[PDB]
Design an enzyme around this catalytic site. Structure first.
Site, PDB file in Angstrom:
ATOM      1  N   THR A 239       0.826  -1.200   0.000  1.00 50.84           N
ATOM      2  CA  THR A 239       0.000   0.000   0.000  1.00 50.84           C
ATOM      3  C   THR A 239       0.865   1.257   0.000  1.00 50.84           C
ATOM      4  OG1 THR A 239      -1.671  -1.273   1.195  1.00 50.84           O
ATOM      5  CG2 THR A 239      -1.936   1.098   1.168  1.00 50.84           C
ATOM      6  N   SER A 282      -6.200   1.116   0.184  1.00 49.96           N
ATOM      7  CA  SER A 282      -6.620  -0.083   0.900  1.00 49.96           C
ATOM      8  C   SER A 282      -8.108   0.086   1.194  1.00 49.96           C
ATOM      9  CB  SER A 282      -5.809  -0.286   2.175  1.00 49.96           C
ATOM     10  OG  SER A 282      -6.340  -1.377   2.891  1.00 49.96           O
ATOM     11  N   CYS A 348      -5.612   1.934  11.357  1.00 52.86           N
ATOM     12  CA  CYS A 348      -4.239   1.561  11.010  1.00 52.86           C
ATOM     13  C   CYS A 348      -3.239   1.966  12.083  1.00 52.86           C
ATOM     14  CB  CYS A 348      -3.837   2.193   9.678  1.00 52.86           C
ATOM     15  SG  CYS A 348      -2.174   1.650   9.146  1.00 52.86           S
ATOM     16  N   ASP A 389      -7.196  -3.288  -5.604  1.00 48.20           N
ATOM     17  CA  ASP A 389      -7.036  -1.962  -5.039  1.00 48.20           C
ATOM     18  C   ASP A 389      -6.235  -1.083  -5.997  1.00 48.20           C
ATOM     19  OD1 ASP A 389      -8.425  -1.733  -2.536  1.00 48.20           O
ATOM     20  OD2 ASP A 389      -7.029  -3.161  -1.668  1.00 48.20           O
TER      21      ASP A 389
HETATM   22  C1  HEM Z   1      -0.553   4.681   3.027  1.00 49.48           C
HETATM   23  C2  HEM Z   1      -0.253   3.622   3.784  1.00 49.48           C
HETATM   24  C3  HEM Z   1      -1.328   2.804   4.533  1.00 49.48           C
HETATM   25  C4  HEM Z   1      -2.673   2.824   4.401  1.00 49.48           C
HETATM   26  C5  HEM Z   1      -3.572   3.654   3.446  1.00 49.48           C
HETATM   27  C6  HEM Z   1      -3.203   1.872   5.354  1.00 49.48           C
HETATM   28  C7  HEM Z   1      -4.530   1.601   5.514  1.00 49.48           C
HETATM   29  C8  HEM Z   1      -5.066   0.771   6.467  1.00 49.48           C
HETATM   30  C9  HEM Z   1      -6.478   0.484   6.630  1.00 49.48           C
HETATM   31  C10 HEM Z   1      -7.656   1.046   5.787  1.00 49.48           C
HETATM   32  C11 HEM Z   1      -6.584  -0.372   7.645  1.00 49.48           C
HETATM   33  C12 HEM Z   1      -7.884  -0.959   8.208  1.00 49.48           C
HETATM   34  C13 HEM Z   1      -8.140  -0.218   9.519  1.00 49.48           C
HETATM   35  C14 HEM Z   1      -9.505  -0.558  10.071  1.00 49.48           C
HETATM   36  O1  HEM Z   1      -9.835  -1.767  10.171  1.00 49.48           O
HETATM   37  O2  HEM Z   1     -10.282   0.386  10.389  1.00 49.48           O
HETATM   38  C15 HEM Z   1      -5.270  -0.649   8.161  1.00 49.48           C
HETATM   39  C16 HEM Z   1      -4.996  -1.502   9.211  1.00 49.48           C
HETATM   40  C17 HEM Z   1      -3.737  -1.909   9.557  1.00 49.48           C
HETATM   41  N1  HEM Z   1      -2.569  -1.444   8.990  1.00 49.48           N
HETATM   42 FE1  HEM Z   1      -2.389  -0.031   7.592  1.00 49.48          FE
HETATM   43  N2  HEM Z   1      -2.155   1.292   6.043  1.00 49.48           N
HETATM   44  C18 HEM Z   1      -0.990   1.847   5.574  1.00 49.48           C
HETATM   45  C19 HEM Z   1       0.278   1.547   6.017  1.00 49.48           C
HETATM   46  C20 HEM Z   1       0.577   0.609   6.984  1.00 49.48           C
HETATM   47  C21 HEM Z   1       1.897   0.291   7.471  1.00 49.48           C
HETATM   48  C22 HEM Z   1       3.150   1.022   6.941  1.00 49.48           C
HETATM   49  C23 HEM Z   1       1.761  -0.686   8.385  1.00 49.48           C
HETATM   50  C24 HEM Z   1       2.785  -1.425   9.279  1.00 49.48           C
HETATM   51  C25 HEM Z   1       3.978  -0.918   9.546  1.00 49.48           C
HETATM   52  C26 HEM Z   1       0.356  -0.988   8.506  1.00 49.48           C
HETATM   53  C27 HEM Z   1      -0.193  -1.923   9.347  1.00 49.48           C
HETATM   54  C28 HEM Z   1      -1.535  -2.090   9.611  1.00 49.48           C
HETATM   55  C29 HEM Z   1      -2.087  -2.982  10.616  1.00 49.48           C
HETATM   56  C30 HEM Z   1      -1.246  -3.890  11.540  1.00 49.48           C
HETATM   57  C31 HEM Z   1      -3.416  -2.878  10.582  1.00 49.48           C
HETATM   58  C32 HEM Z   1      -4.446  -3.623  11.464  1.00 49.48           C
HETATM   59  C33 HEM Z   1      -4.706  -2.755  12.692  1.00 49.48           C
HETATM   60  C34 HEM Z   1      -5.737  -3.356  13.618  1.00 49.48           C
HETATM   61  O3  HEM Z   1      -6.611  -4.142  13.168  1.00 49.48           O
HETATM   62  O4  HEM Z   1      -5.694  -3.028  14.830  1.00 49.48           O
HETATM   63  N3  HEM Z   1      -0.337  -0.194   7.637  1.00 49.48           N
HETATM   64  N4  HEM Z   1      -4.353   0.065   7.420  1.00 49.48           N
END
Ligand code: HEM
Length: 399
Positions: A239, A282, A348, A389
């Site tokens: 992403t 995403s 996130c 996506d």
């Molecule tokens: C532009 C970059 C990113 C976008 C747009 C993005 C977007 C998202 C979205 C839409 C979710 C779902 C959140 C929800 O359920 O409400 C999410 C969850 C998550 N993202 Fe990202 N993300 C990005 C970068 C990252 C990075 C760099 C990491 C790790 C270093 C990461 C790790 C995670 C994790 C672990 C979750 C699950 C969190 C949870 O369920 O508690 N993401 N992200």
């Protein structure tokens, strides 16, 4: 009931269905790959309700969970990490790794983020483009988030390039299944060994913190540590790559706004906020099943029925964002949050890190390369397949 996921209307555009559904049928049923029906939620207010309602579950072994492909159905069988947990298990495990991703922690990382971006830009400059365009994805958009998250996890510098390539192979559209699952096994095996090492001599990295604070006391075992490390690697990297490439492409499509960023790099944060709203890279992560009957808008969602909440649609919601289909980094922002990173408890974990990476990139890229140009006609940009996506596969540039 229409088949879901919908296809994007074109390379850089969301599915056309969403605008129609928001206007005429904002909570509707869709047909998933396996013939089951799920509820699709499209308005910003309703997405926020789905993301926070305590009547809805993320546990994937509950009846009705809306898996979108056959591989998700079998992935559901593995022992869950916190991405697939409900309270209170969710925050019990999420809090083990949250300290690295807080706004304070990310502020301290900022010199290292800037140095990573600087070094990779200088490498690209030294490579030059004297023999044809270079791929901004391969040369810059891929290594920037990869090197950073690998380094936070604890991967030594000499291993970064190989492991960056393996993780890209995982998600590359032209990989065969054998290539992708081999790359996946390669990553899991490497992390298992790194966990064994950090158990014996911890360093100052996420894996070391897990081994010292959680594995040795017995709160989790080492295989959980591997799974958690793996989740932090694969959840957001592809992403991040796509967001960087989409920002460059978006700026090439809006010359007036690129000129403003060139003359005022301090606009990078505002450009990043609009980028993450406009290009919701995403868009299929906010899924639930109903633990009890629940009313959403004018629809009754029965217990054991699946829900998909489109934050992509919510980010174009005319009722929240004025002129939502215009890219405008100078827009005035309403009180409601854009939902590029989700909402509620599951929002996130890396939102602040992601924005700081994106902000560092777009405040530096055109200072380093003021004449950076997409080398192919903008109508020929190689976007990701329309059934996936939004993203960019490769981006030839000159500078
Ligand atoms: C532009 C970059 C990113 C976008 C747009 C993005 C977007 C998202 C979205 C839409 C979710 C779902 C959140 C929800 O359920 O409400 C999410 C969850 C998550 N993202 Fe990202 N993300 C990005 C970068 C990252 C990075 C760099 C990491 C790790 C270093 C990461 C790790 C995670 C994790 C672990 C979750 C699950 C969190 C949870 O369920 O508690 N993401 N992200």
């Amino acid at each position: 009931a229409p088949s879901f996921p919908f296809s994007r209307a074109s390379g850089p555009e969301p599915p056309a269905e969403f605008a129609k559904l928001r206007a005429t049928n904002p909570v509707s049923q869709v047909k998933l790959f396996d013939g089951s029906l799920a509820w699709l939620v499209t308005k910003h207010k309703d997405v926020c309700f789905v993301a926070t309602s305590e009547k809805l579950s993320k546990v994937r072994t509950r009846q009705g969970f809306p898996e979108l492909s056959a591989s998700g159905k079998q992935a559901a069988k593995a022992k869950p990490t916190f991405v697939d947990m409900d309270p209170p298990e969710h925050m019990h495990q999420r809090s083990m790794v949250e300290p690295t991703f807080t706004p304070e922690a990310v502020k301290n990382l900022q010199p290292y983020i800037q140095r990573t971006v600087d070094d990779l830009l200088e490498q690209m400059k030294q490579k030059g483009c004297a023999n044809g365009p270079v791929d901004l994805v391969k040369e810059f958009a891929l290594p920037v988030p990869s090197y950073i998250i690998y380094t936070l996890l604890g991967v030594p510098f000499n291993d970064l390039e190989y492991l960056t390539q393996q993780n890209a192979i995982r998600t590359n559209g032209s990989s065969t299944a054998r290539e992708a699952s081999a790359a996946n096994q390669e990553l899991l095996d490497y992390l298992a060994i790194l966990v064994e090492q950090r158990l014996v001599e911890p360093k100052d990295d996420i894996i070391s913190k897990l081994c010292t604070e959680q594995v040795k006391p017995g709160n989790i075992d080492k295989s959980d540590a591997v799974q958690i490390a793996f989740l932090l690697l694969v959840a957001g990297n592809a992403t991040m790559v796509n967001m960087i490439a989409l920002g460059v492409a978006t700026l090439a499509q809006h010359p007036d706004q690129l000129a403003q960023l060139k003359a005022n790099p301090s606009l990078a944060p505002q450009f990043v906020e609009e980028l993450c709203r406009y290009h919701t890279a995403s868009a299929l992560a906010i899924k639930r099943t109903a633990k009890e009957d629940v009313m959403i808008g004018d629809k009754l969602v029965r217990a054991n029925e699946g829900i998909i909440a489109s934050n992509q649609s919510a980010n174009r919601d005319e009722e929240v964002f004025e002129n939502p289909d215009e890219f405008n980094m100078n827009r005035k922002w309403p009180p409601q949050d854009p939902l590029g990173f989700g909402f509620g408890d599951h929002r996130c974990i890396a939102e602040h890190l992601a924005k700081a990476e994106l902000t560092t990139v777009f405040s530096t890229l055109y200072q380093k390369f003021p004449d950076l140009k997409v080398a192919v006609p903008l109508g020929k940009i190689n976007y990701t397949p329309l059934n996936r996506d939004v993203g960019i596969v490769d981006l030839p540039v000159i500078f």
